[PDB]
Write a protein that binds this DNA or RNA. Structure first.
Ligand SMILES: [Zn+2]
Ligand SMILES: [Zn+2]
Lengths: 497, 497
DNA sequence: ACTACTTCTGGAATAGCTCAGAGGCCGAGGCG
DNA sequence: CGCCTCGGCCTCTGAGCTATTCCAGAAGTAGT
């Protein structure tokens, strides 16, 4: 610093008048000078205008005098006055247009308070009161903002969540009982706007445009992300869900989920490694080498695992067993998805009978450009614009049908699931694993990684969590408690007992 | 003469805003056109904007319209209106900054009056006052509220419903006859707003948004609340409907409904337990164990019990008797629904009993993916994009058609209904049950859950309300009177009488 | 089916709101 | 004792937002 700043810190500028030549009169001013000069003017100004409020602050080894005047005055006069009392030093006084926000920012770092004609801050020209009967307009900006912070992407959810804020905050059972975080954290703030929102004739539009803005930023921020980064982010959100689940407060017996792991690890040879290999194939996403084929009988695990994996990295599954004149709206669900999963692809005529016939395989054989991922495609939605992008990678699960040579080639890897009675029986005595839908859950798989993969594998950015989580499982499940689960599962009894 | 004024006369430009293209809104405008047009506009402008004052003047072979509007408009809006009114050879619209100076100069030698609103000119005592009130318009919120309290999600229905309140509620037949709940309970309250409503041009819009509100809440709940909660929440709703139903205001004979309980309790063995069972199934939503199958002839009871249970947990009835591809929108109805009911499904092989062959059964077989609930499916809606979720659980009612031992394995419970004579004649002896739709009402099914099942077996949330409702029941209906009803109903005689 | 008529959505166009900058007007006092 | 300037008032305006209306075309529908 040149020891005397040439203007207010760029942290309060948006609250000050941007005028350069105006004879407008204000009632809220802010001077920025030296510690000694401020200290002095604090008393000179106080009486000079019979202020209704005033307060000195600290700013970058200097002072800032924020005061509210009863009557209106133009910065001109306020300035010409403070001048006469200095004759030297630096003095930059301006008009304040954001009273509260200004004072507010000044009471918090990097600004500190020193003096003030009122200990409890203030609420006059500024606010809590004086709201009176001015024209009430809804703030679309504030709705979108909300959507942004809650990373909202569903108009229905938004509309309903915001309508909740319409009600009084102080005595809101929902905020007291603190049921949903994405509510008790934004209500008080969005309360005023919401109440006005409850009267808007454009509710839907306000929400649609909001959610559209979030989807916008999201698609942009993705471009600046690797892909291993996207997976790390996903692992994070999944980990965030987990903290709440197995938390001191929440329905989620960590023991019941570790049971699923013990079950999912017997679904295939070296399960923990497969997932890792899988994840890498999805992260690297290599042209003509980004799809796996899960092939097997009904109730062989190919569906459960595919689902799990699908939730792990995040994404959606689609059903291409339909007329090509309806195959496009379905293919479109893949948009902006990390990975895709073609669930239960059917074939026509094949391998004897008892096998449902369908177009699923035919269709896939006419979507090589979608599987190869060499050239982008035009995924579409209703009433929207044909969004173009590289089709996401994924898995394809199918029964024992005949796969055309052309299609096969697009499957860098094929896994054959063979029914295991010792697994089927184990489940028949573990209702909770199907009840709480744990074997088809990605959280179940993520735990598995945390329990088998070395800390060094996961991204450095979150290795911290992985370690703390790993240690969490160690104390909870000794090399005995868990071994008991694997044993029972291998013997087909009951994961727990 | 050839000029045909490109702008207002120079000596007036001094009181005119020369930025016709702006967002500014004012209440004093001037139009420069020909004699005939001004004369025509004088009348059309007076009506369109219910001007506070208007006058026509002479300006070099042409006319000039000066007028004050009770409310602000932008010059462009005024100009745009005049345009679509008639044809012009030349037209100039400008805002007037200096009101009084504009008029006075228009009466000066250079110009002259031809006609005007108030005989006397724009006297300054009232040439720039305060605008007022602004005609009251329909309250969208208020309509929404109604749709909310009645959980209405049908725009067409809501529209018709709300239009009934337009009429006076004084000598209103429906209001006095206490014929409809969701009418005499709201009419008096919405009368005033419905009156305007009935004259609004956006009726369909208003309702469209009130519905989105109802849809929005369901989307929120399903996304946050747990299956238990949803049910309970549905019970509190049913209870709030029963109170008013059997209340002083209402007109429901609690002694007639309690009869239905006795009848229904004769449809199936341990019926009070079957309902508890059903509820558990629906609430636990366990993969492969979420669907029940009702099979029987007409008035076999299935149609009744199904409908009742459906209302108990609140769900939607579907119809899969369409082409295995034409039912993509009929299945989307399940979106955000607790439970669904595939009513009267048709099959094959019923020719033997004059049972029309359909696609229903064959369709359910190709939707085992939906009935199971192990994976999520993408549900469609007209003009809207796919919704990914696990298809809700429910019931499948069908007549005496054939069911492959492979399809039967898609259901955990199969309640076969058989014709009951001693139960039929009792319905003839008690013709009132059908008339008041008590036989297949979710209310009765709730009462039956109160006249049997334990108290602490309910949710600790609605315990108290169930306790005090279990009072009035026995405290009124003798512990034997019910027994006498559940007797003659097994004989063939009327319930009560 | 392929083609002719209807309902629905999103984006464009149109309209009204309030804020704060750039300046014009004017009584009252400073000063040689 | 009159030019000049201070300091509060007020309005015309560019701007950014919010509110309503319109509209071309896609999504869904009935029928040859
Ligand atoms: Zn709250
Ligand atoms: Zn009525």
């Amino acid at each position: 610093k040149v020891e005397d700043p040439k203007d207010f810190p760029s942290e309060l500028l948006s609250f000050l008048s941007h005028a350069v030549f105006s004879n407008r009169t204000l009632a809220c001013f802010a001077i920025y000078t030296t510690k000694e000069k401020a200290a002095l003017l604090y008393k000179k100004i106080m009486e000079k205008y019979s202020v209704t409020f005033i307060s000195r602050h600290n700013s970058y080894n200097h002072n800032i005098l924020f005061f509210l005047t009863p009557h209106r005055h133009r910065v001109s006069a306020i300035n010409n006055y403070a001048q006469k009392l200095c004759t030297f030093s630096f003095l930059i006084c301006k008009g304040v247009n954001k009273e509260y926000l200004m004072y507010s920012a000044l009471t918090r770092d990097p600004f500190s308070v020193i003096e003030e004609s009122l200990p409890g801050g203030l609420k006059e020209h500024d606010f809590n009161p004086e709201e009176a009967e001015e024209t009430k307009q809804v703030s679309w900006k504030l709705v979108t903002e909300y959507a942004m912070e809650t990373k909202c992407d569903d108009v229905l959810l938004l509309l309903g969540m915001y309508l909740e804020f319409q009600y009084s905050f102080e005595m809101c059972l929902k905020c007291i009982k603190k049921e949903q975080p994405s509510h008790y954290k934004y209500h008080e703030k969005h309360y005023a706007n919401a109440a006005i929102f409850a009267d808007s004739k454009n509710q839907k539009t306000i929400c649609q445009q909001a959610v559209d803005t979030v989807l916008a930023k999201k698609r942009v921020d993705s471009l600046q992300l690797t892909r291993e980064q996207m997976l790390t982010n996903r692992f994070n959100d999944l980990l965030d869900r987990m903290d709440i689940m197995f938390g001191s407060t929440g329905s989620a017996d960590i023991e019941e989920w570790m049971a699923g792991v013990a079950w999912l690890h017997c679904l295939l040879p070296k399960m923990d490694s497969v997932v890792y290999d899988f994840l890498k194939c999805m992260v690297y996403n290599i042209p003509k080498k980004r799809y796996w084929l899960f092939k097997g009988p009904i109730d062989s695990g190919k569906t459960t695992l595919a689902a799990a994996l699908l939730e792990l990295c995040g994404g959606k599954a689609l059903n291409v067993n339909l007329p090509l004149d309806r195959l496009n709206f379905e293919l479109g669900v893949a948009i902006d998805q990390f990975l895709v999963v073609f669930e239960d692809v059917k074939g026509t005529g094949g391998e004897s009978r008892d096998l449902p016939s369908g177009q699923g395989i035919n269709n896939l054989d006419n979507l090589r450009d979608y599987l190869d991922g060499s050239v982008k495609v035009n995924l579409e939605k209703k009433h929207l614009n044909k969004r173009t992008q590289i089709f996401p990678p994924g898995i394809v699960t199918m029964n024992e049908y005949s796969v055309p040579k052309t299609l096969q080639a697009r499957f860098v890897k094929q896994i054959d699931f063979r029914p295991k009675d010792y697994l089927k029986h184990c489940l028949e005595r573990s209702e909770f694993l199907l009840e709480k839908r744990i074997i088809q859950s990605g959280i179940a798989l993520l735990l598995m990684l945390i329990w088998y993969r070395p800390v060094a594998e996961f991204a450095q950015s979150i290795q911290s969590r992985i370690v703390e989580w790993k240690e969490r499982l160690d104390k909870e499940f000794s090399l005995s408690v868990y071994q008991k689960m694997k044993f029972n599962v291998a013997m087909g009894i009951g994961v727990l007992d």
